[PDB]
Amino acid sequence: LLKNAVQLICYPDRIGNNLTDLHTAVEKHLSDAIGGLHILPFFPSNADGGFSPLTHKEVDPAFGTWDDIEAFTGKYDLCVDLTVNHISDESPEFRDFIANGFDSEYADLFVHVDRFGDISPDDMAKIHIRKEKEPFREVTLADGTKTRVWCTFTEQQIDLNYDGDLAYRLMESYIGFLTSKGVNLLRLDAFGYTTKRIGTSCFLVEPEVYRILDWINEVAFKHGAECLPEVHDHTSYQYAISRRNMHPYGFALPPLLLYSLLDANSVYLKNWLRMCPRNMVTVLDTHDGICIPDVEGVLPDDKIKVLIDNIDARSADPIMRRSAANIHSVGAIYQLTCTFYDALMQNDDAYIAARAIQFFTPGIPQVYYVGLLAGCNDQELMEKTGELRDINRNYYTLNEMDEAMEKPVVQRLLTLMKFRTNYPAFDGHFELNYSNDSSVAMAWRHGEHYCHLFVDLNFNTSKIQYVDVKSGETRDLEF
Amino acid sequence: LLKNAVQLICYPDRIGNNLTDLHTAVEKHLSDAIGGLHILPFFPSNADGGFSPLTHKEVDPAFGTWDDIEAFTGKYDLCVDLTVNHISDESPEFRDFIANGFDSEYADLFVHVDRFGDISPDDMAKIHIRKEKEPFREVTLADGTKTRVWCTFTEQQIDLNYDGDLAYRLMESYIGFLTSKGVNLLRLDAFGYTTKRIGTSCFLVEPEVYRILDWINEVAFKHGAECLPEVHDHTSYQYAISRRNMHPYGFALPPLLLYSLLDANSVYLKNWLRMCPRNMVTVLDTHDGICIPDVEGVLPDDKIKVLIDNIDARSADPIMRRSAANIHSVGAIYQLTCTFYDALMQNDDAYIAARAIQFFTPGIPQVYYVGLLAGCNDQELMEKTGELRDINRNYYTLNEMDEAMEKPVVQRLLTLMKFRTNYPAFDGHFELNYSNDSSVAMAWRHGEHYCHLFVDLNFNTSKIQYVDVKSGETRDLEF
Amino acid sequence: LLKNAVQLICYPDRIGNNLTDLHTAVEKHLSDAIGGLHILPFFPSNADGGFSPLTHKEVDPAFGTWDDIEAFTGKYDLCVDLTVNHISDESPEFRDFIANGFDSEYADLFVHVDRFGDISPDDMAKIHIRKEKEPFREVTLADGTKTRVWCTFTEQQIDLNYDGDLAYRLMESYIGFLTSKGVNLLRLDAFGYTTKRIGTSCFLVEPEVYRILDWINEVAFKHGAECLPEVHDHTSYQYAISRRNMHPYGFALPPLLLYSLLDANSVYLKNWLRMCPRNMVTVLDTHDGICIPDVEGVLPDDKIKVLIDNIDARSADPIMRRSAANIHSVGAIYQLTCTFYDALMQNDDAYIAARAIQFFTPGIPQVYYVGLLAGCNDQELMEKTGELRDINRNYYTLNEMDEAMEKPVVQRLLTLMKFRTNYPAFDGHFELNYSNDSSVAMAWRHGEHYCHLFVDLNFNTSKIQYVDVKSGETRDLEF
Ligand SMILES: O=P(O)(O)O[C@H]1O[C@H](CO)[C@@H](O)[C@H](O)[C@H]1O
Ligand SMILES: OC[C@H]1O[C@H](O)[C@H](O)[C@@H](O)[C@@H]1O
Ligand code: NA
């Protein structure tokens, strides 16, 4: 069991300069407002913001040491990424492949494109790949031979072969090591691409995907860890995850709420909460930006397009899904590049009301560090480094964070976080209440404990009433 | 009969400094990659990038001499402009009109607005306008009298009167001189504007336009030349040209391919290839902007707005087709001001694929020099001269071209150009192949010679298989 | 080479009672108004209105004898159907397959489904079939063995195998026999389905389709006959046919005029006329319903829907394409079940104006007999026999035809037919004229001969002025 408490999502090096400064910031400000951390990839990596790890057993010295990670465990749950799809081209295992060729003992760890034979144009177009080139890298071996390996993402990320056995060893090896350092929750990064079969989309291929997923879940449970598979596709996949004793992501909530607050409409939101999957980890913002496929169905297309058209002016160029010439269409946008606070027009009341609704949604709530600090789109950071997503990946010095913590909106968010992390009613059962089509009433009951949220989307007001058991009376949370 | 080879579209003075530097670059890089040249207007001109010639019988000394032109004819086809619509106001023929008035023997060579009497506003609205004012210039005669002449374009370009006889004389004289210098292909510039009749659109007025067009074709054949009539409107006009033993423009192809690659959609392209006008000169980019009206019907309107909206960010202010009686009105989009490479987001694979599809399209392919060198939008040049289309009219020094020739994408383009100009299969018959809705299959067969293009618009991939006749085996072209 | 004259489309037994009554009716009224006939299938048939022939070498005694056929030849062109795709299951060739099994010498004449092995679900969904059943018929052999054959249409129609040799003879045998009886023009029924290749649409498969189509055309040319391949799909195929010395169908014209007249719009019509494929056979109504896919592109989707909604009230249930649950969507309708006269709301002026535009469209005009007699939707005939297309397949007795010939509107149409068949200008060249966007101006010139149509689509007015060579002056055709 994880702590039913708010979690902080954060990089190692963007609050302060390293894992030690991160720990300093948490203890100074968040020591009793969060119950866990999701520390974004802190491994030796050579691509894509830490998501091309050479191994899961080392910490990039630029960030700290394993002792600096274990400083968080013992008081906080620890969520860490497991890049189950791919490992770096600089990894010991893949470098051994280039030197020795197919004589390498790590050969069957990777996907060899010539194994599949000729792939028809139809089977190629099926493949759910998000840039405009084939997912195939031609690498040159030490002996001069040219061969191709499966490569979904950037070329420094070589995909693993779940049709062989070696890949399961490596994950089981990684999991054993991470759990020994105190990892409670394994975020299964990009698991949907693990399933390759020519003739299918090679993404979330059923029922193979769940067998791979049940296996990893068993390994984590053996080593005292639960799983958080991250998938950006139709929400029906989140329920499949939910029904296999794993934590799905509440990705539908961010755009569902953004539309809901901007348009003063509680209908689709109440419909969702009433049927939202269980054991999910709810988010508003992530390190990636607001994802659209995750709300298809949850929100009608015309209302999704209203959302897209409303945010376009406050957001940088969106991340696109491939070959979508119609760049202002629901079917074209993959992720909206925007801080969540800019998505609500820097409206304090709207942002707090959103976080309250998140906190009363069933599941473990994660708060992204930029959102924690009510960060705005980082134009300056985005314009250097070229990374489109850095618009939501502010760097903070410890002073700049101390200063952001004094903003009135952050003090308000900080009270919600303390209330959600400590008040016992959230350990009970969720009971949605009746409301009109422009306001939402959410409540939690655990024995004598009870708390009740009411948000009027017409005026962005947030009211929480809770029962103080030490006195029996009903008080107003001041936030 | 023209050479079935790639042609270069180029100015005299924008590779190096003159026609002499131009000839140097052709022999160094393209000597066996092109079979002809379209050298943009190199006559004495006083407006609009050479298109206001005082005569077609002289070479602007800033560019070179007629001897510099004939250096190209001995080895290459020569396509040169015939401004059938207009000649300069500094021309001898028009200056004689200013001095002597209507007593000049060249008076009936020009269109006098006063023939019509009053022109009602309704008759004005029929005529489209390429300037910001009515196409009527008030000129002052030597004796002080004020009279008006028809002037479609800039006021230094005076339109000719094809209701009289003098205009046919001048064209026949112009044609004779150019063919005597080795000109094979006469580009009839803006011939659609030659037909004037109040009560009509004064543009492509039927059937007068075809009689004017059959006449010039007659003169050219006598002097050993074929014609390339330039008309930017519905593709139906391109077929009428094809059916009169003239070369139409494959003007439909550029915006069609831009869409086909951007959206990974081969349906509309495949339909067009199946019915494309025959004996046409195919282009992707020209010395002008990418023209939209030329793809109506070929491409549904909703997809055209998609295409236009996708290019808006990568293109300058568009050229508009305004009507009269309404001179300060946004009007309809005519040409997108953009390099073809910036129109494909500078995606190398997509650009090579575009040229591959062009080169397998039936007809003589022209490659515009900027496209040859994978040039980007020239913001600095456009802002320096104020000419909106100079964003696609880059200047290259001999060094700047030599360096651009070593770019990998230009090396790939140069391999295709050598293949298309030399491989004999293109002299046979075109045979389109079946494919899915995201790929194109084009093939050419001439006896034992056979070559096969496959372009997957999902991944922007280009594959050509050709048969080496001296051995009978099938090889892959490396590009 | 055919007579450039109006042709009659007619059944054998639906004017009068047999072919002799047809000959009687033709000579009495049309003897100098048409130059040829399209006699719909008059062979022994057991399915689909005559299109399931047991042989092309016999005439169904219910219709007459071959002598009744040769009575038309010598004075009229003769167009007869060649069902190149399929022959009846009661045919001599196929019964031998049932009797002997694969030991039959006619075994390789038919397509055996088990030859292809497993067909993936994707390869089945590709198949362009407009029914909701697999195009596979399970037949029981005489020896009890069960095997499957390819069957596009009704189960009495077994498809032919153009991967073998027997199919080509059977056509060559049919063609030799039909041309020996005086047939000029072979209507190649449903030729698009002759190409089978698993993984393709099995319809118009390029370039195989032209391999088959160039073959038949020569075999027909050998025996003094030209071909009329019927295909209902995008017009690009019509030019593809046109460019191989065969006659395409002007299938785009019927719905194009219907829109143009109903909405007073000549824009798309003039565009088509300017570029329409020629050496085509033009039709307005046929023995089939008014076909929608043949005008996609020629007419924008929004304007096609205008047509569909206007015809919905005056038409029976339309024939649908496969799994088209959206019964009010351009992409769903295949053919509109309606006579052409009811499609123009029984407006005499509008119907004549349509026929006038047809007769001046480049190509051989066919007049369907129901259109000839200005027939209305036959509710009674449709509700009996259950055949949805019989709403356009009126039965006429010899009296009923004599009576309809006296209708004022039929007298006008009969004047046009004489003019289009006899006036020599139509043997010259087509010249489209300028007109506003709500009227059409069409003219023909052949030497001294000249005729000029002007149709105002606002008011359905028809005027034809011709140069009478018997006096040299310009007269008005009275219709
Ligand atoms: O309609 P277009 O093609 O842009 O105009 C054409 O005639 C004009 C005057 O000759 C020139 O401005 C263009 O360079 C030429 O291509
Ligand atoms: O595979 C790694 C990529 O996708 C993952 O889901 C990460 O969340 C994203 O930040 C990264 O770009
Ligand atoms: Na693409």
Numbering used by the authors:
A (entry chain F), B (entry chain E), C (entry chain C): 2 to 480
Authors' account:
Heterotrophic bacteria utilize GG phosphorylase (GGP), a member of the GH13_18 family, via a two-step process consisting of phosphorolysis and hydrolysis for GG catabolism. Like MaGGP, MsGGP falls in the GH13_18 subfamily. The proposed reaction mechanism for the GH13_18 family involves a double displacement reaction, forming a covalent enzyme–glucosyl intermediate.
To the best of our knowledge, this represents the inaugural structure of a phosphorylase complex containing αGlc1-P within the GH13_18 subfamily. The MsGGP–αGlc1-P crystal (P212121 space group) contains six protomers (chains A, B, C, D, E, and F) in the asymmetric unit. In the asymmetric unit of the MsGGP–αGlc1-P structure, two protomers are characterized by the presence of a glucose and a glycerol molecule occupying the active site (subunits B and F), whereas two other protomers showcase an αGlc1-P molecule in the active site (subunits A and E) with clearly defined electron density. The αGlc1-P could be modeled in density but appears slightly crowded because of the narrow binding pocket of MsGGP, suggesting a high degree of substrate selectivity. The glucosyl moiety of αGlc1-P is stabilized by hydrogen bonds through direct interactions with residues Asp49, His87, Arg188, Asp190, Glu231, His288, Asp289, and Arg390, which align with the glucose in the MsGGP–Glc–Gol structure. The phosphate group of αGlc1-P is effectively stabilized, oriented toward the exit channel, forming two hydrogen bonds and three salt bridges with Tyr335, Gln336, Arg131, His233, and Arg390. Conversely, in the MsGGP–αGlc1-P complex structure, loop A undergoes a conformational change, approaching loop B. Despite pushing loop B toward the active center, the channel formed by these two loops measures less than 5 Å. In contrast, in the MsGGP–αGlc1-P complex, the structure remains in a closed state to promote αGlc1-P hydrolysis.
